[PDB]
Amino acid sequence: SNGDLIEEIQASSTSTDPRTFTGLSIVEDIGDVVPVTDNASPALPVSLTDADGNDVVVEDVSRILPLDLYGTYSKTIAGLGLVDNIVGRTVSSTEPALADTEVVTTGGHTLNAEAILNLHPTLVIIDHSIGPREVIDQIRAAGVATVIMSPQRSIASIGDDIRDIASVVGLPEEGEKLAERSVAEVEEASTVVDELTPEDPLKMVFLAARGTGGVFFILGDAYGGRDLIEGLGGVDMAAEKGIMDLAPANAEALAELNPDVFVMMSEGLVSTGGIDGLMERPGIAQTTAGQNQRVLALPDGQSLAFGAQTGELLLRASRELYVQ
Ligand code: HEM
């Protein structure tokens, strides 16, 4: 599907200065993960010690709930061959295959125990990027095999995070194939990013926006803002300022960070009123990025998911950032 995207990248002139670009650039949804197999056959049972130290036996993966903040696990499970086993999702797993699949979070990202248990899951794969913890404890006590992950969520660890998921569902060979394919795709995209990156990198921040009120934050280290921005050839000003979790995107913060580009989730930007609404927020219009109305909007459920589609995300995003 990249045949025409790559022709546009090769065609960009060498004189092109990305600091002169203005306005929104949006990456369209990348879609479903291409599975590495059509006939996955989980080798079960598996016993493991999960990231919280719990001993878990996985003996039935017919009804999976792969749940997290970022949208990673549902995509990896589909990449391994088990998309048809997914029986519920969070709001972050926006991929088309799951669009008719029951949502088990409420009010954004809150786990709902009743919704989960009414789906009669046989395996929950989850991490503490969403909660409450108490709901995770309740479904385990009710009898649902629950596996806590703690993925490294860096570009360098995309492959190991995939291998860890594959080991939970008894598909090590599919895991090795999907890991290697996903890391090769990143490396290929990184060479395009390097060829497109200006000599002085663009300053970026990841701006989280949900609604027209106070859900308006600079995302820090813990969410993976830095890993994405550096993967795009940028400098993450949140990382420069030592933001480990998040910081309010108020006028003082924005003035101090002074990015050249705001990186945002697409539906997040819509929810604050689009570019016009974002430009009304205090401090935005005064930054370099605001003066150029320069926003890179990425599909919400891929933007911080990393995983299998990272390379495609970096390729499309670097074309939007650096190619006119
Ligand atoms: C910090 C407080 C946050 C609140 C109160 C919040 C709330 C919400 C709400 C209410 C939605 C529903 C949007 C819709 O139905 O279209 C949503 C969607 C979403 N959120 Fe959050 N969120 C927060 C943080 C985050 C963070 C840190 C991430 C990082 C991955 C994230 C990722 C997503 C994604 C991927 C979606 C799906 C948007 C879509 O439907 O396309 N959220 N959030």
Author numbering: 33 to 356
What is the paper's account of this structure, in its own sentences?
HmuTUV forms an ABC-type heme transporter system, in which HmuT, HmuU, and HmuV are the heme binding lipoprotein, permease, and ATPase, respectively. CgHmuT consists of two lobes connected with a α-helix, both of which consist of a five-stranded β-sheet and four α-helices. His141 and Tyr240 are coordinated to the heme as the axial ligands and Arg242 forms a hydrogen bond with Tyr240 in CgHmuT. As CgHmuT is a substrate (heme) binding protein that shuttles heme to the cognate ABC-type heme transporter CgHmuUV in Corynebacteria, the regulation of heme binding and release is very important for its physiological function.
The purified heme-bound proteins were crystallized, and the crystal structures of H141A-, Y240A-, and R242A-CgHmuT were determined in the holo-form at the resolution of 1.30, 1.65, and 1.30 Å, respectively. While two different orientations of heme were observed in Y240A-CgHmuT, heme was accommodated with a single orientation in H140A- and R242A-CgHmuT. Except for Tyr240, there was little difference in its structure including the conformation of His141 and Arg242 compared with wild-type. Two water molecules were present in the heme pocket, where Tyr240 is located in wild-type. The oxygen atom of proximal water molecule in Y240A-CgHmuT was superimposable to the oxygen atom of Tyr240 in wild-type when comparing two structures. These results indicate that the proximal water molecule is coordinated to the heme iron as an axial ligand with the formation of a hydrogen bond with Arg242, as is the case for Tyr240 in wild-type.
